[PDB]
Design a protein around this ligand. Sequence first.
Ligand code: HEM
Length: 94
Amino acid sequence: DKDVKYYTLEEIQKHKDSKSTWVILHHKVYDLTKFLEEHPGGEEVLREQAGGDATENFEDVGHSTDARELSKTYIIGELHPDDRSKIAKPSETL
Ligand code: HEM
């Protein structure tokens, strides 16, 4: 039906290059690997954001109510509860 796969910052961060363009959004992990070109906005912005925060960019943009469901298709795992208690807070920002 679906499950997560709680992954840590480091693990996710490794999955940025070549063949696993993962990202953290809101408080959970997405794969956008095949989505790269499909993404009606551009690859490059994703690849820049790859294994970094990209919600902070997405949210300002305010993605469509459709992407909101499709997101749950791209979802890979959740943000491990380890770092969660920290989220050594990017001090801000957007
Ligand atoms: C890594 C985080 C993401 C960033 C930084 C990002 C950024 C962008 C940008 C800059 C655009 C173009 C907006 C414009 O030209 O005005 C866009 C459009 C779009 N994105 Fe993303 N995106 C992200 C993740 C996603 C995901 C996961 C999905 C699918 C759930 C998605 C679905 C879409 C759709 C449907 C559009 C078209 C919006 C429209 O023109 O109506 N994006 N995105």
